[PDB]
Amino acid sequence: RPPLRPFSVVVASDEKGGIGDGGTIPWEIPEDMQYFRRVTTNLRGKNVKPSPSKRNAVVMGRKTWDSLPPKFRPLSNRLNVVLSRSATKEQLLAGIPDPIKRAEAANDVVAVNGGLEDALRMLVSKEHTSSIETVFCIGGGTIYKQALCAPCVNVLQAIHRTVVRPASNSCSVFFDIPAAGTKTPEGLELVRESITDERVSTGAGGKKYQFEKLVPRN
Numbered sequence: 001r002p003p004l005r006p007f008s009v010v011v012a013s014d015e016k017g018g019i020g021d022g023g024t025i026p027w028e029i030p031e032d033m034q035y036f037r038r039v040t041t042n043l044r045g046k047n048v049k050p051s052p053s054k055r056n057a058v059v060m061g062r063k064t065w066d067s068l069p070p071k072f073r074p075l076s077n078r079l080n081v082v083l084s085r086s087a088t089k090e091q092l093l094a095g096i097p098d099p100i101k102r103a104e105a106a107n108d109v110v111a112v113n114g115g116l117e118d119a120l121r122m123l124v125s126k127e128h129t130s131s132i133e134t135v136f137c138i139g140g141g142t143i144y145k146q147a148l149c150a151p152c153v154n155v156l157q158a159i160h161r162t163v164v165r166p167a168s169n170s171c172s173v174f175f176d177i178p179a180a181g182t183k184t185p186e187g188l189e190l191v192r193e194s195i196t197d198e199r200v201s202t203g204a205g206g207k208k209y210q211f212e213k214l215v216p217r218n
């Protein structure tokens with residue numbers, strides 16, 4: 001069976017696993033926004049600037065793409081891989097209000113009529129193996145779930161999770177991660193590799209957050 005491209009998950013969720021209200025993210029944590037940008041944009045080695053020749057790819061569901069404000073659509077300096085059963089590349093670009101930016105964005109957007117697995121099969125192509133350094137799954141609910149299920153979970157390299165507290169009173173969409181010291185029936189157990197001390201966001205509500213990195217146990 002054609003092998004799947006390895007990948008990492010980047011997500012922000014509260015203790016109840018909440019990640020959103022169905023349409024957007026309920027909290028304002030600029031520190032996470034900035035960290036997310038750096039983590040998904042940065043290329044390894046010294047002074048390697050992202051370009052179509054080599055850059056990371058961010059895989060997201062169509063609803064997550066729609067959730068991106070104009071200033072973040074597409075996510076610059078990264079290949080935007082959008083999963084949709086109906087929306088084509090042109091249709092995804094059609095929603096970008098600035099016509100010149102929309103023209104410039106054509107080079108950074110690819111539509112996949114399939115789920116995460118389909119995206120990973122595609123990112124394994126010799127073209128992408130060279131031009132795409134790291135693949136980051138960035139949501140939302142439907143995509144995160146596929147990430148922790150076979151066969152995708154078998155090539156999951158790490159989870160960069162921003163833990164948010166206190167729990168949101170607006171979350172209806174979740175990301176179910178197995179608790180520490182627990183192994184899912186499917187066979188996945190995560191181990192903390194690192195975690196920052198809790199900090200208070202300068203954002204509205206002053207949410208308390210931590211940047212945690214988890215990896216599958218082997």
Ligand SMILES: NC(=O)C1=CN([C@@H]2O[C@H](COP(=O)(O)OP(=O)(O)OC[C@H]3O[C@@H](n4cnc5c(N)ncnc54)[C@H](OP(=O)(O)O)[C@@H]3O)[C@@H](O)[C@H]2O)C=CC1
Nearest residue numbers: 012019020022023024061062064085114115139140141142
């Ligand atoms: N806290 C966090 O870190 C993050 C939170 N979010 C939030 O989560 C919510 C969105 O999550 P969610 O509702 O799950 O939507 P998703 O972002 O997961 O997108 C789901 C959509 O993607 C496409 N899709 C999913 N699986 C397949 C498949 N197998 N084949 C083809 N297309 C597929 C389909 O779009 P189509 O309808 O076009 O067919 C589907 O409706 C929002 O509240 C958002 O703000 C999003 C990212 C990160």
Ligand SMILES: CC1(C)N=C(N)N=C(N)N1OCCCOc1cc(Cl)c(Cl)cc1Cl
Nearest residue numbers: 010011012024025036067068072138139162
């Ligand atoms: C949650 C966020 C950023 N943080 C971490 N750690 N991990 C993620 N996967 N993230 O979401 C990526 C896709 C949605 O991005 C946005 C959504 C909104 Cl609503 C706005 Cl205003 C700006 C951006 Cl870039």
